[PDB]
Each structure stands twice: as C-alpha cells, then as structure tokens.
Design a protein around this ligand. Sequence first.
Ligand SMILES: Cc1cc2nc3c(=O)[nH]c(=O)nc-3n(C[C@H](O)[C@H](O)[C@H](O)COP(=O)(O)OP(=O)(O)OC[C@H]3O[C@@H](n4cnc5c(N)ncnc54)[C@H](O)[C@@H]3O)c2cc1C
Ligand SMILES: O=C(O)[C@H]1C[C@H](O)CN1
Ligand SMILES: O=C(O)[C@H]1C[C@H](O)CN1
Length: 1214
Amino acid sequence: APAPFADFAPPVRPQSTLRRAITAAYRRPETECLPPLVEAATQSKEIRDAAASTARKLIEALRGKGVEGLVQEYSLSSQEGVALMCLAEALLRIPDTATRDALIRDKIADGNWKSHLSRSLFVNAATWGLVVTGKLTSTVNDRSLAAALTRLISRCGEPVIRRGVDMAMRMMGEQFVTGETIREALKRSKELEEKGFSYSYDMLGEAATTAADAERYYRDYESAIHAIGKASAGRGIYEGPGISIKLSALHPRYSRAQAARVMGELLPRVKALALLAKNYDIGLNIDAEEADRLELSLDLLEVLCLDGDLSGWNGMGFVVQAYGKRCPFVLDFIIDLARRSGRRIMVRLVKGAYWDAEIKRAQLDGLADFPVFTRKIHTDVSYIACAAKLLAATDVVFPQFATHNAQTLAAIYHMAGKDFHVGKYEFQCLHGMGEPLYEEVVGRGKLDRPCRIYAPVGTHETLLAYLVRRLLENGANSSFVHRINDPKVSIDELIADPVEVVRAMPVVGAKHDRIALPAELFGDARTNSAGLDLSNEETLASLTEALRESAAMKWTALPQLATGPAAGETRTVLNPGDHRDVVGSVTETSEEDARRAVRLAADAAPDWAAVPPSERAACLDRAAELMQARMPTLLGLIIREAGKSALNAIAEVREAIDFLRYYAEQTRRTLGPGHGPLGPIVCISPWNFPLAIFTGQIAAALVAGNPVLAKPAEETPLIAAEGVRILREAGIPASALQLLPGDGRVGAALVAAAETAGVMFTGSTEVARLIQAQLADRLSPAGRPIPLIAETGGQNAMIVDSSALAEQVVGDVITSAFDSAGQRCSALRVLCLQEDVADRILTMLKGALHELHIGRTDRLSVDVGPVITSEAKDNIEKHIERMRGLGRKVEQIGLASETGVGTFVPPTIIELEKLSDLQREVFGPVLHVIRYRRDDLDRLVDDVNATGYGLTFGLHTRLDETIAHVTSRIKAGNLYINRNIIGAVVGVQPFGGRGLSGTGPKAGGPLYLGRLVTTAPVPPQHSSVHTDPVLLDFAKWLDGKGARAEAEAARNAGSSSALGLDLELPGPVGERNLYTLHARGRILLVPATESGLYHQLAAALATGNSVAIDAASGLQASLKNLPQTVGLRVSWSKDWAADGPFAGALVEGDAERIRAVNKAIAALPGPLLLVQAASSGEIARNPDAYCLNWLVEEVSASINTAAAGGNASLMAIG
Ligand SMILES: Cc1cc2nc3c(=O)[nH]c(=O)nc-3n(C[C@H](O)[C@H](O)[C@H](O)COP(=O)(O)OP(=O)(O)OC[C@H]3O[C@@H](n4cnc5c(N)ncnc54)[C@H](O)[C@@H]3O)c2cc1C
Ligand SMILES: O=C(O)[C@H]1C[C@H](O)CN1
Ligand SMILES: O=C(O)[C@H]1C[C@H](O)CN1
C-alpha cells in the first residue's frame, strides 16, 4: 500500500538556484518587478536622443507610405462589410473555381443567397468584424448580418460579390498566411530573402486534444522541416529559414500535472524533430504559450540542450515573453544553460500573446497576483531591460528581437552599438504586418540589421481558428500598430521613452487601476477566497508536506451535543480510492441523542438569536479566515475521505470560504430586529460537497439567528467534524451548532422532532420527497408550514451547434461530464450535437476521453478519482451494462489494476438515439450523447425541459439568434454559454434550479437568508420597475367588480414584485454573469374565501405566474367575466395531480385546513412545491401574508465573453 501523498507531485528534476529564482518571481508584486527593470534599461542621454531620432525617422517613413477601399467603393456599412467577407469565405469553401463563379453569377447575385449557402455563413464573423471595424464582438448578430447581406447583394449585385471574393482570397491566401502550404510559402519567400530578410515558418498547430491530433501536428512539422531544409540548401541557421513549433500541438496533455507523460512522450517527439532540423542545419524555435507552461518547457529545453545526439547544431531556439514577471530570470537560466551545453541558443524575445487570458485565469483561480504585467508600458520597459541582458551575452546566445514597435526597435538598435555581424543578433517581425517597418531597417541603405519574418502557413480553416488572438497582438488600443494608424496620436507620443515615463511615475510599477487583483474581485463587499497555484513548484513542495502531515492525523467525528460529545457506535472511515487507507474514525449518533439534540437547540435558541446579526456575521468571517489558513490540511482530508482531486478540493474549500463571507455580507446588508429566526434548523448535507455545501447550509442558518443540527452524509463525517471545530473556534457556541454523524435513522429523527423549525436538505429527489412528506404532518407554533429548502439532482444538458469550436466544446464536455467522477449535481449528463458536426466532435471527444488518468487522488497526475461507495459503483455500472445490452455504443477508458482496491467507474460515453432513452439520473462519470437536426432545435429544447429537471444547462454557439432562442425557451436555474457547466461561484453564479432540481431559493444568492427567518428582509438590489400587465388587468377587473381594497392590494403587489429584475454581478474579466427574476410557472391556489382568492391571485399574477385554482373551494362564482388576458392565466383544478406540474402553492385556511392541504400537496407527483399558507385573518392583517420572494424564479447565466479568442473590454486597458 503506497504511502499517502508520497508521490503527489515530485518535480522533473531538483530545482537549481537559477530555476528557483524563476519560480520566486512567478507572481511578484508589480511594484517590486519594475525598479530593477528600469535600471537595466537605462541608457545615456546621448543614446536616448539618438534612439528617439531613429524612431521618428522610422515612424515618418511608415506614415508616409484593401477592405477599407471596398467598403468605400460600395458604400458599405460595417455590418455589410462583415457579411460580405463571410459570404466570400463561404464561397471560397467551394473548391472548383468555375463552379464558384457560376454560383455567384447564376444564383447568389440574382437573389436568395440563403437558398444556396448546416453551417451559418457567419460562423467566423467575429473575426471578420475585427478585420472590418477593428473592434471585437464576442458573439455574432447573425440576423443583422443576414439582413445586411441581402441588402448589399440586392443593391450592388455580382460586382460587389466578386470584389469581396477576390479580397478574401488575397487576405486568406497571402496576408494572414505566407502560403496555404509550406511549398507555396517557400516559393513566396524568395522575394524578401533577396532583400536581406530571413524566415521562420509557423505551421499554425496548437492545443492538441487527442493523440491523433498530436500525431497529425507531428507529421505536419516533420514534413515542413523537410521542405524548409531542402530549400535552405546549406544556408545555415542565420541566413537560412527555420521552423517554429508549439509544444501544446505535440501532446494532448501538455501540463505540469502531467509532467511525467510530457517528459516521457512529448520530449522524444521534439527530439526527433530537432534531429531532423540538425541534419538540414535549420533553426527550430519553441514558441512560448500560457504562463503555466513556461517552467515545464524549461525542463524540455534543458534535456534537449544536454542531449549529445543534438550536438554540433546551434539551431535550437526558445521564446521568452517580456510581459512575464519571470522573463529576466528565465533569461539568466537560458544563458547559463547555453554556457553549460555549449549550444548558442537562439532566444526570441517577444512581449506576449496571451495577456487577457492570463488576467482572466489568475482571477478565476484566486491567485496572489498576475504572472504578467498589467500596464503595457511595464512590458515595454521589461522588454528593453531584457534586451540589455541579451546583448551582453551575444557570445553565448543569439538574441532575436521580435517587435513591431519602432520605439522599442530604435532603443535596441542604439543599445547594441556600432559593431555588428550577421549572427550577432537579429530582429523579427510578423508576415504581412512588420515588413513596412523592417523595409526601413534591412539593407545597407537602411540600418543594415537583418529581420526574420515569422510566416504563418496553413489553410483557411487552420488560419481562422486563432486569428482573433493574432489580430489583438497588434490591434488593441495600446498596440503600436493601432496607434501609428491613429492620426490623433502624434509622433512625439509614439517616440516617448517608456523607461523614463515609468521612472517618473508617482509609484513605480503600480498595478493598472482598472484591473482587480483576484482577492479584490468583489471590492468592498467581501474578500475573495484564495486558491493555490498547482503549477508553482514552491506551492507543490509545501503542499506535498502539508498533505502528508494531514494523512498522519487521527481524524475523528463524534456526536457533538450542546452538553459535550456523546457516546455511540464507532467505525472507521476508508478512502474510496483505496479501502486499505483508513482516514479516521466516526462515532455515530443514537436516535435518542438526535432527539435530545433538537431539544437542546430549542432551549438555546433565544441565546443565539440575541447575538446581534453583525456579531453572528463576524463569526462567519472568522471561520472563513480559519478555513483559508487551514486550506492545505483541509485539502488532504477532502482528497482522502471524499475521493477528490487536489484541484477540486481547492475549489471546494474556496466555495466554503465564499459561502461564509457571502452570507456574512448579506447579513450585514439586511438583518434587523424584525427578521426573527425560525428556530432550530436541521441541515442535511451530501457526500459530494462534504465541506462546501455542509458549510453553506449551516452558515446561512446560523447567521440568520437559528441554532443548527448538522447531519452530515454518512460517507463523509470527518470533514464535517472539522468544519464544526472551525465554526466553534470562530465563536459559534456549542449550543448553536451540534454535529450528529450517522445514517438515515439520525436524519429521520431530526426531521420528525417537534421543535425542528426548518430543514435544509441537499441530496436525492427521492429522499427530499420523504422529508417533505414528514414535514407536511407538522406546523410551526404559529400554525404555518415548516420551511424546506431542498436542492436535488439534474439531468443537465449541453447543446452544441455547428458554429462552436470543437476544441473548446470537447474541453468543456470532458471537464463537465467527468470532473469529480461525474458526482457533481451540476455535471453534464446529456450532450446534444448538431448532426453536421456530431461525428467530428464525437471522434475528438472519444480521443480526449482516453487521455484521462483514473486512480487514487493523492497524485497530481490523477484526473478522475473514485466514486464514493461500492453501492454507487454498482448502480452506475448496472446502467452502463443495460445500455450496452440495448445495443447502444459505449466507449470506456481502461482502468489500471491499482483501481481494484477502491471503488472506480471508468469515464464512459454512451450514444443514445433520443433524450427520452435516458430515464434516470446516473450519478457518475457517464456522458450520454444525442444528435439533432438544426430545424429540430426547438423540439430538442422541449426534450430537455421534458425531463422535469432544471439545474444546469450549457450552450455552445457563436450565433445571437440561437442564444436568444435557446435561453428564452430552456427552463433551468444555471445557464452557461460557451464554457463548462460546473463550479458555480458563490455570489457570481448563485446556484440552484427548478422543477425536480429544487425548491430554491438559490444558495450563494441574495434570497437565501430570507427563507431562514419568519419575516423576510428586502435583499440588496431586489426590486423591479416593471409591472406585470395581467396583474394590472386583474386590478382593473377588481375595481370594476367594486373590490376596491383588493384592487389596491393587487396594485401594491404589482409594485412590490421584483419580477423582471435583471442584474450583472461582479466577477472575473472575460465573463458576464447575469442574475434575473422570472415567473415560476403555474401556482396552485387553494383559497377559502373570495377575498383570499383575490389576494392569492394578485400575488401570483404580480410575479408573472399562471394559476390553477382548487375547484373544491366553491369560489368559481367569484371570478366571473375575467378579461381574456387574465382568463388565459387562470384554470380551475378538480384533480390537482392531473393538472401539474406546479411551481408553487398558496393556501388559505385555519391551521387544520393548512395541514390537510399541505399533506395533499406533498402527495402530488413531480416537483416539491414551495408552499405558503395564511389564515383569512392573516390575509386581512398582513399585506405580505404571501411573500413575493418565493413566487419568482431566479436564473443565473454565465457567458464566456472571451470565447471568440480575446477580451474586447480589455483591448482598452493598457
Ligand atoms: C516574430 C514574432 C514572433 C512571436 N512569437 C510569439 C510567441 O512564441 N509567444 C508569444 O506569447 N507571442 C509571440 N509573438 C507576439 C508578441 O509577443 C506580441 O504579442 C506582438 O508581436 C505585439 O507586440 P509588439 O512589441 O509587436 O507591439 P506593441 O504594441 O509594442 O506591444 C503590444 C504588447 O504589449 C503587451 N501588452 C498590451 N497591453 C498590456 C497591458 N495592459 N499590460 C501589460 N502588457 C500589455 C502585450 O504583450 C501586447 O502584445 C511574436 C511576435 C512576433 C513578431
Ligand atoms: O479529528 C480530530 O480529532 C482532530 C485531530 C487532528 O487535529 C485532526 N483533527
Ligand atoms: O458544482 C457546482 O457547480 C457547485 C454548486 C454547488 O455549490 C457545489 N459546487
């Protein structure tokens, strides 16, 4: 039995002093990075004057010497220009020229283009939008583009189509790429090579998703090296052409978490390519990618440069990104490696291509700081400082200064001084972008310095995949190329010296004012939880030790009553990934002690309610600080007791911290003396989030003033006991928080106890239904139903159309379906693929499936851990085998023999014919896949809704018409557009669904605390200026019947309702997080009196709902001659079970009537109804007898606005 965490994340090699200096700088404060860069980049006044003169001369030449001319000739609007280029792109998908010209002449020009051109014409319109307008719009208004295309064709005919086709052909064949193939690119390179330029070819591959993809990119690089080497014809690595590669293209799991596979499988591939480049004597450059891949790539560079089989060749090259805080330290490492190996490493200094993605990622992950600068001028100073370091080492490395910025260029030209020879250093630029500048540099008649052109090579499909990111390199508001084209920017502005500008700022190196540190994402409202960087070797080393220490601890969980720990039956808790690993011991609660616990909580209820809300919130904030400090140890317990990966354990502890701080802040915003506690609340928590949901339910109940009986899942008591220890240490009294470990007998006794005043349950729908039936037997002392918040499963779908990017889809599907072994309630269960792209995406999905590592989760390399119990495993496998036996196609990964000691299910893909083939939630790593025809999209949405669930839902599309259609018709609580569907963030995507998925209100949202008090407060931001029009028609009808008081109450309900609330919640960059209040659906009305019915109807209509009114009330004659608008919303029900599903209920009657109706409602099949009851007298006395908070439905929508390849808002931040 391997020792826990003994092999968690060992580094590829011991970290040298130089390597440790790199890691130390990963997230160094920006104010600390800049001063040494300013010093290194300083030059004499004479040089600064000379450089500014050279920069001015270059800029004057640039300003002194396609799409815009076409837009001008045909008087096109922006949208017409975009639509025309999309049409041209589509016409170029037609291979035969004569067939294309005939279609243009005979079909496209004369009328309907739609009739002749499964795939929207406008799939890539975000890219063409950048080309035409210079602005990035993340999604495509395809109806606007269709209108514009019809308009321009009907106005201008074939001539404009011809001009568009020829323009797109030139751009996609000669500007965005040097050529479609390496042979074509090589042919076109001779012209500028004769003028003194050189070339490095970029084959445009990246981000392999499957082994087959990586093999394809490998053979593409190999064939390109042959073509380039044959063409080089012995010119060598400086005069002759080279190749550039991306490591992410060569392996589907290129990450620090998979470092062993990277060194074992990726390294030999790079070696084989490098050996071929050595034989032809050409350059081979390793491009730089995301920040979390930098240090891993150094391990490959180290091995290759030390490998004697590559000796004698100086063509190995490596990019370093000056926007990165580690850049000078990376350069120190590379220069030393060059000295040790004797290889003259070609070092390409760039600024960096992934800036906005790095900002978003650091924010999402809650890390200490960014790994890149946040002010553009800081990157500029960094670049010049790093150029000074490189120019001092030209005997051991070959510096390659890639930049289009004439000020940067001039500074380095003068820094390098007067002595020059080919091979000392060079500049570099991008094909079809940097030549105007560098034609003022190359040649004896200019500055006599060489320039290497980075030349993309590929087909239209390949070049369009990441063209947005490339366009943003030179197209943002702070980009030199954008500014030189802006006439409002003077040459004096362009030649400003960033080194001296930074030196003179008040605070040198200050973070950009408009970019929030991850900790400050929520500003003054609350402090964001902090995560851990699993790509940082210092973090991995310290975590390894903390995790090992956590596994040596004798974890226990006991019945912790108000009076002290109680005795009980004691058993061990075993690691689900390896039952030989005993995690701890649990003593379970007797039924007698559970009943005693409720009585003790009732006795203590006044003393806890008397603790002022601000002080209760302070306990929660203290507990959050304690959990943050304890995170490494908490990770270890979650990993071993609950079977989670480290990554998911971090996110869970973060969620617990976020719940504590969110409910504390919401309390500080709302709770006062009139919002009295319910009383003792029984909190029943699940094993799949045994810290986060455990903590969230309990923290909310406590901070609202209620003592808590905490019943954790039988499988996961240890983390629960630790959460209770932390809450008590933070100041929660033992009488206010009692822990009752055990099985369902304990939960049942707690629910049934007469003093239990409310229940918070997260778990299965079937158990929630049993709890509901027990609670319906009771009323509060006030004679009202006992509140139940019951959050249950989902049958969560994702719809993918032909405009989505397959690589993005597959990554989001693999994560959503198989993360946490599919044991998230949010997990993706049914993937729906548009028929035209289904086979391609399915092939990629199956290939990605087989790259997952399944095993015991005390290793960083494990992607999917065990399921929670043998019973869970057996249930899941029985489903898989039933599907297999029905002839459905089943794909499964093979499991290692080491899995036999635990309870594992392999990630599995099952292809179904129709959604209805799936009849039950399968709570494991099992993705079902269906296909749909585009015209059947609306029926498919019906099929998704038809399950009766409504928790999470995903949509991958670029098309606004499809977003509008699908999001308006889907009925789910948590929507996700162009991203995964898991990991809802407290206060950002408030979490919870409808129908069979939950009662609400949403956890991590602003209505939650109000359900835990007898009189609900007004939540922050909770209002709406919109009045339901059927409500208004009803109020007029009441006035016409003479029911003046009820008409006034109806108008007041119309105003009080928050239906229509539509907010954007603060969160990370590159995402829009929306929170909206809608109608719930059809509310069951059980009135007793005419006035009661009018009040019930007013409340339901003001919140946008329809109603079914109990026909047994005998009140039909009270609703004669309704306006048709109101009649459309009103039905009468004799058989309530036949007329559902309902989305809530309002009941009028005395206590006995309320109890009988509540029991009848619990018997209705389908969703658990949120029931509100009042007596006739309460309706007369209290305008809020029926609270409108519970008659609306919350919807969260999270849209990934960076999905098109970059962040439009961040293009303005420099
Ligand atoms: C030949 C060549 C090879 C390249 N190879 C790579 C590669 O392997 N890896 C890679 O990542 N990119 C690569 N690049 C791209 C390069 O990193 C730049 O993104 C791009 O060339 C524009 O920078 P600049 O010096 O041309 O112009 P500039 O307008 O001077 O600089 C723009 C750059 O400033 C930086 N920046 C913008 N805003 C901010 C901000 N608010 N805070 C901090 N920094 C900011 C960004 O890095 C941005 O790209 C390459 C570029 C060329 C020409
Ligand atoms: O569970 C317990 O009893 C304690 C002991 C150690 O501190 C880990 N938690
Ligand atoms: O899995 C998720 O999406 C979130 C929702 C719940 O709070 C548990 N974690």
